[PDB]
Amino acid sequence: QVTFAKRRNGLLKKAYELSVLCDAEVALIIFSNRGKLYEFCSSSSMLRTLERYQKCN
Amino acid sequence: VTFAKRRNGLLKKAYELSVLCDAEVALIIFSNRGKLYEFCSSSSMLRTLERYQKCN
């Protein structure tokens, strides 16, 4: 997927921007079709954000 | 607020990435008031988070 790198980088960047601009807590997990993991979390740790998520629902 | 705009944009682009590049995507967003928004491309958010935990 020739556009994968571009879209991935764009999404990681915009996730970061949302967290910075709006004081929002953001977690983003991406697996490529080859199974490569890319991720962003705005908080002290991804685990903490996932734990926060589970507590709602 | 431009929170709404950027949020909607991110949710949409996450969807596009999953569809256009056959990628598995999970996205969790808490507003500064603690409102939860989310997108997951798979059958369930839990399954994708479980996949995530299995890596390093």
Residue numbers in the entry:
A (entry chain A): 18 to 74
B (entry chain C): 19 to 74
Authors' account:
Structural elucidation of the MI domains from the floral regulator, SEPALLATA3 (SEP3), shows a conserved fold with the I domain acting to stabilise the M domain.
The first 18 amino acids, which are predicted to have no defined secondary structure, were disordered as were the 17 C-terminal amino acids, and no electron density was interpretable for these portions of the protein in any of the molecules. Each monomer adopts the same secondary and tertiary structure with an N-terminal alpha helix (α1; aa 18–40) and two antiparallel beta strands (β1; aa 44–48 and β2; aa 55–58). C-terminal to the beta strands is a short loop followed by an alpha helix which is contributed by the I domain (α2; aa 63–73). Each SEP3MI monomer dimerises via extensive contacts between the pairs of alpha helices and beta strands from each partner, with dimerisation required for DNA binding. The dimer interface includes hydrophobic interactions between residues in the N-terminal DNA-binding alpha helices, Leu28 and Leu35, and pairs of salt bridges between Glu34 and Arg24. The formation of a four-stranded antiparallel beta sheet further stabilises the quaternary structure of SEP3 with interactions bridging the N-terminal DNA-binding helices and the C-terminal I domain helices. The I domain is anchored to the beta sheet via hydrogen bonding interactions between Glu56 and Tyr70 and pi–cation interactions between Phe48 and Arg69 of the partner monomers.
